[PDB]
Write a protein that binds this ligand. Sequence first.
Ligand SMILES: OC[C@H]1O[C@@](CO)(OC[C@@]2(O)O[C@H](CO)[C@@H](O)[C@@H]2O)[C@@H](O)[C@@H]1O
Ligand SMILES: OC[C@H]1O[C@@](CO)(OC[C@@]2(O)O[C@H](CO)[C@@H](O)[C@@H]2O)[C@@H](O)[C@@H]1O
Ligand SMILES: OC[C@H]1O[C@](O)(CO)[C@@H](O)[C@@H]1O
Ligand SMILES: OC[C@H]1O[C@](O)(CO)[C@@H](O)[C@@H]1O
Ligand SMILES: OC[C@H]1O[C@](O)(CO)[C@@H](O)[C@@H]1O
Ligand SMILES: OC[C@H]1O[C@](O)(CO)[C@@H](O)[C@@H]1O
Ligand code: NA
Ligand code: NA
Lengths: 605, 605
Amino acid sequence: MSVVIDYNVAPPNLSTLPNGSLFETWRPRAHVLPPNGQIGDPCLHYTDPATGLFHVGFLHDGSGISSATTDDLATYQDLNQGNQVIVPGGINDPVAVFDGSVIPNGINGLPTLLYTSVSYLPIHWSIPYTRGSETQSLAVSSDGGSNFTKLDQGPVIPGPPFAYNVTAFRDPYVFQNPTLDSLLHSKNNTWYTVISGGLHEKGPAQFLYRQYDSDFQYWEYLGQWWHEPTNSTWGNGTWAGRWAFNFETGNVFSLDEYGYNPHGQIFTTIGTEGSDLPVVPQLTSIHDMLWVSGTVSRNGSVSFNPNMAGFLDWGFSSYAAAGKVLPSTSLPSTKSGAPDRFISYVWLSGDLFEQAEGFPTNQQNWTGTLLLPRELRVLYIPNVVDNALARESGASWQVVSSDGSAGTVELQTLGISIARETKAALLSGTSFTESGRTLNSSGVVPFKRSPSEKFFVLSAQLSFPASARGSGLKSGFQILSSEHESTTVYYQFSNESIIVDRSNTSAAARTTDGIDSSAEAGKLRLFDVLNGGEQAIETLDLTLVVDNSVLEVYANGRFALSTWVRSWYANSTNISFFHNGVGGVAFSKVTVSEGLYDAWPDRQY
Amino acid sequence: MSVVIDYNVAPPNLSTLPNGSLFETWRPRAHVLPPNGQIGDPCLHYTDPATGLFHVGFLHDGSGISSATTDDLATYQDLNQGNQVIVPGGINDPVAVFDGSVIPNGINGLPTLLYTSVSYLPIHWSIPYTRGSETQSLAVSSDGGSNFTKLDQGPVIPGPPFAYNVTAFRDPYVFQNPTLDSLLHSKNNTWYTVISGGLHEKGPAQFLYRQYDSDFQYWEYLGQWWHEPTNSTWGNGTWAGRWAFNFETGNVFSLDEYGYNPHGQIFTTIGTEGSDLPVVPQLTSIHDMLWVSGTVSRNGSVSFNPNMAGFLDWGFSSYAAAGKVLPSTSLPSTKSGAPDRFISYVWLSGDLFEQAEGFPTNQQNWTGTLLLPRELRVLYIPNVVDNALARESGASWQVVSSDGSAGTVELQTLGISIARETKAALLSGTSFTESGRTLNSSGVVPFKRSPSEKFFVLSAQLSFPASARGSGLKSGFQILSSEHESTTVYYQFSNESIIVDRSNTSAAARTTDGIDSSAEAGKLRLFDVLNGGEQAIETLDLTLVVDNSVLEVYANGRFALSTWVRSWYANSTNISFFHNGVGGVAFSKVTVSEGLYDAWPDRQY
Ligand SMILES: OC[C@H]1O[C@@](CO)(OC[C@@]2(O)O[C@H](CO)[C@@H](O)[C@@H]2O)[C@@H](O)[C@@H]1O
Ligand SMILES: OC[C@H]1O[C@@](CO)(OC[C@@]2(O)O[C@H](CO)[C@@H](O)[C@@H]2O)[C@@H](O)[C@@H]1O
Ligand SMILES: OC[C@H]1O[C@](O)(CO)[C@@H](O)[C@@H]1O
Ligand SMILES: OC[C@H]1O[C@](O)(CO)[C@@H](O)[C@@H]1O
Ligand SMILES: OC[C@H]1O[C@](O)(CO)[C@@H](O)[C@@H]1O
Ligand SMILES: OC[C@H]1O[C@](O)(CO)[C@@H](O)[C@@H]1O
Ligand code: NA
Ligand code: NA
């Protein structure tokens, strides 16, 4: 007959169930992930100039790269039924295919992938590097992006600069930039490539190259344009993790206030691989997903000089973001009226980067997802009170101007928001509002109405009184609640953090191994702001997207924290206000939009 | 019963015979070749410091490198029963293993092979080069030289210098040299490597490197220390072929008057790949085996500056020589009392570099041989008459001093002779002498006694009168003669050449395809010399070694010409004086030593 899963009945040890039986249990409907199996780093994204279609890529099942297309930046169509567009086992990549990026109009006017071809394993920053384990090779797709055919020749970058003792040398990221062109006297619209890694006994680095010939064959090395001492940190480690022991997945792009701009301010996103001391061999224990703003100067060699940094996503399991310029002329942008954008997809590892021992993987028959596509832009925060909170150095914002008479500053930071078409589609269900209210005493106050399924967007503003500052206040929402389970998301002033408490999230965690229930946290400063003569603590503007087990928490256009919320009971759908009674908090009207949408309309599962 | 070969009966079309049936027909007994099958370039030679044994290597059956040892530099023992000590099919060399050389005391004090690992074919100077087709990789033998184990890592030299459009990039030749050390301020006894090839639209070259680390991992590029314009030539092309379109098998070593000397004069041997115009794609039509003397200077970068050049062997099929320093402390040198030597083995291709269409290869079941080991040294020619013959520039000798009163000069050139232990062993048979005589009229004059087998050394001096100069004289010997066959070897003044006429050598060439009968030739100048007051044309001092089908012609300690003489009839063993009647010629007593010896005493075949 069939395998019988009834989510009103208590879970077994989930490891005892048949393979595939929990395929739908925690599976999102509005996120990019393959038809089944494991997803790794995103990469390979490009806009096809001939069609305007946006292609997304990701590592799949540890055997190369799979891909999908989108004509709206909301929904996707698989290429090759989800099967890889390039796989290991060639002359240059006999052991593995790691991340690569695409020159959309490359050799013969075709999408041209420059990627890390792997010949020797293991590879880790903590151990000696095997010579030639990572090279960079070319492949070209002449069939619309379903198959990237390896050029029948050796790698175009056959290793690091002479005698460099690299920790890593991978994830080539191709990009154009007119500011670099002027500084370096490059031909206009030269392609640059950064390769990510570092050097033993020195620290993490991005290795910079430029196209030497129009055939993409030779790549002139321009030095370690950005490097940091081993396990150093931006500021004192508060706002942007650590530079740690190795850089991965370096992206480079340039922004203004609306989106992507070639002449704009220059940013990079990187993963950093961290560790406690002493180092455990071959173990990266901390996977930080950072963004960094910087100025670019030259003294013989070009240099990127960070002036602020933060997290692109604060989630423990968030890492390895890959993004791409998406021009206004693309199919999605033409329909939505968007200007040029930089769209970034963060990876949410499904199994704690392969440390989640005993998770029911064969039952689920999939592992991991990408997060919602995110638009990156320069965000300005006006009318901020010029005080110590605003003026802190080594943080994730900087003062760009002053008004002495008003007593204020204008702050600059990285804007992070859900890509506009995806956001509209997430909100396309049916909506209802809960009335605003002030809470002063301790407890959870049920919503009058809660969603009946685990697929929703909750939006709300939280306004705090002056005395909340430095207090023991905790305020937010309890979600996915029933008598058996609950998840609490709250702001906490004591350490200026958004917290996701997962201690009670999953009844399955009580009966099964490998179901992480540890707290998640990200730093967020609410500044003192001036609005029509009166000073107040900045409003907390919250968006929670729950897509079955995938939780993404956005705040104030500049913050994201994402995690797994693997609730079991069909019942666990209630929402409540939460406040710990330390001070007062005023909640606006809360909007709940239920159902999301189907990001994979041509799949049945 | 058996396949019936009777060498008194006329040959069939040899291609019709059973496989292996002609295994012994033309097979040498005193030369280095594998137990069966094809031999290519020699390479890999080294003296094992722990044992004093000299190892020889050669490409075998187009699938890697085979090896043998010798404790006397006369006889050899196979390693692995003739099976390869290293074969293609690894990560770095999936398609082929080309030449390599050995640092005898390398990694872990073991013989360390640096060799060309091949990943893409075809490779030829005349066509576009496939990127990464040739890299240089390391292997180490920990079992006495029977197996060279590939290091489990990528190549240590993963391609040519940045953006160089090489014609070829192979045959790494490791060597030490104190003169380079001083010029470059290298650590004492630094290992150098030259790699051979050239650049498209520029010409042939040797790429020079030095050891950067004691682990042999990194090789610092020191430039094209020697290069020549495409298809240029030493002098006007008379004495040293052409530099042609590509250099192969570059060896570098240093000599004095006795043998090898680290502080001596610097020499290189190279193969050059030539062609008529227009170029036929993928065809090298001329394979020149050159030696070159040069001085080494520095102006920022080091440079080798040729001051004379010639052929190491004039044979059309002679090519690809590999040689090695053999110290006085070796097993062979200890027994013979030799000083440090440089021993070179020339390749004699068996099939015109794979152009010999229809040769009975499967019948023979072997292809090619190495030539006799040769000692190289600086040779001086005293008491030469200071005239235009001696003073010619762009030749294979140079004046090193003058005696104005005597009217003479002392010349310098490369000495080429059979290695001393091999020579003694070749002469170990039974000897007889033919009386000297003067010949004035035309014809062939039979020896009173000729050898009864096709295994002998014939030595003789030919003295010419003053009028021979510029005349139509031809004088020498007819060998391997009967009513059906003959081979004539003679000196000819009209173009100062030794000629081997093979028009009548092989009755099998009349019934079978692919049995070359074209003439062979090498230039040799006999100078005017002064000996006790009287001026005479220099004596022609000739040594002919016939080892079944392998003919090597030596003259005057400075000349060698080698070829195939594939006579059929058992009868074809007679020797005669030869003279064409143009002038007079005085032959000394001719010594004939018959039988040679068995260079492979632990083989039965
Ligand atoms: O899967 C390869 C791909 O992932 C990244 C970032 O997640 O590398 C991570 C990692 O696990 O790869 C090796 C394992 O061999 C190890 O050093 C790292 O910790 C990215 O850089 C790669 O392209
Ligand atoms: O067999 C490889 C070995 O031989 C040499 C010299 O004889 O190369 C000769 C040659 O035939 O190799 C390639 C064929 O792929 C072609 O370009 C040459 O003409 C030597 O350099 C190699 O190590
Ligand atoms: O830069 C990171 C590297 O630095 C070290 O301290 C020394 O190599 C290692 O722990 C690590 O591999
Ligand atoms: O925190 C930024 C978030 O704020 C919103 O604009 C709220 O409507 C969302 O679209 C965005 O993701
Ligand atoms: O240097 C040799 C090379 O030079 C050329 O003329 C141009 O590349 C070719 O015939 C040959 O490949
Ligand atoms: O041409 C040089 C030859 O001359 C000899 O010394 C003659 O006895 C040989 O040993 C040598 O090969
Ligand atoms: Na993370
Ligand atoms: Na030749």
